[PDB]
Design a protein around this ligand. Structure first.
Ligand SMILES: Nc1nc2c(ncn2[C@@H]2O[C@H](COP(=O)(O)OP(=O)(O)O)[C@@H](O)[C@H]2O)c(=O)[nH]1
Ligand SMILES: [Mg+2]
Length: 199
């Protein structure tokens, strides 16, 4: 089976667990790891070159005691660093999560995700999101609760992991029905703000 360990890191409360739980089978088939304080979610996606499985390591909350232990990271093949777009301090900590990540795994492909963009009073805007630009990463706005851009980080990762740019997902995974509707107005504005920042 084509399988990658994906570690999901970032400040406590950014919505890392809410995000991974959108993938319904991934939540139903998760495996708790005694030693490590971790739940590992098998997120399978179906691409035009066959199935791929992201084994997502979600923390049990230990990041809310200080940077989790070293074994959580080892043998990761890819990563998502999350922050919260309504809390600047979580954005300020990205370089730290990245430092730890690169300290234990080297140059694994890494997607940066700004979460909770369904929330109207957004604090960390496209213009201020520059970290991915310097450290060679991919950035996406997401809203875990509305499934907004859910597939994007995993499509970009699959593209990088497999070595292929035209790779598509042939079918969407079954996702938790949205708990908020992502405001189409807000989506358009954000997409416009990103395109502008990027030029
Ligand atoms: N509005 C909004 N709230 C969210 C989103 N994702 C998570 N949350 C809320 O943020 C809080 C922290 O979520 P959690 O998944 O436990 O974060 P973690 O500590 O990084 O695992 C919870 O109250 C979630 O309901 C989102 O996309 N939008
Ligand atoms: Mg969590």
């Amino acid at each position: 089976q084509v399988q990658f360990k994906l570690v999901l890191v970032g400040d406590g409360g950014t919505g890392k667990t809410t995000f991974v739980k959108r993938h319904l089978t991934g939540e139903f088939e998760k495996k708790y790891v005694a030693t490590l304080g971790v739940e590992v979610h098998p997120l399978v996606f179906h691409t035009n070159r066959g199935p791929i499985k992201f084994n997502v390591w979600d923390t049990a909350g230990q990041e809310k005691f200080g940077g989790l232990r070293d074994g959580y990271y080892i043998q990761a093949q890819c990563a998502i660093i999350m922050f919260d777009v309504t809390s600047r301090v979580t954005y300020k900590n990205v370089p730290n999560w990245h430092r730890d990540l690169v300290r234990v795994c080297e140059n694994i492909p890494i997607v940066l995700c700004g979460n909770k963009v369904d929330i109207k009073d957004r604090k960390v805007k496209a213009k201020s999101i520059v970290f991915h630009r310097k450290k060679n990463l991919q950035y996406y706005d997401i809203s875990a609760k509305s499934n907004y851009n859910f597939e994007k980080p995993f499509l970009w990762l699959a593209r990088k992991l497999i070595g292929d740019p035209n790779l598509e997902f042939v079918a969407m995974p079954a996702l938790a029905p949205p708990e908020v509707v992502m405001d189409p107005a807000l989506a358009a504005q954000y997409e416009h703000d990103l395109e502008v920042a990027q030029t």
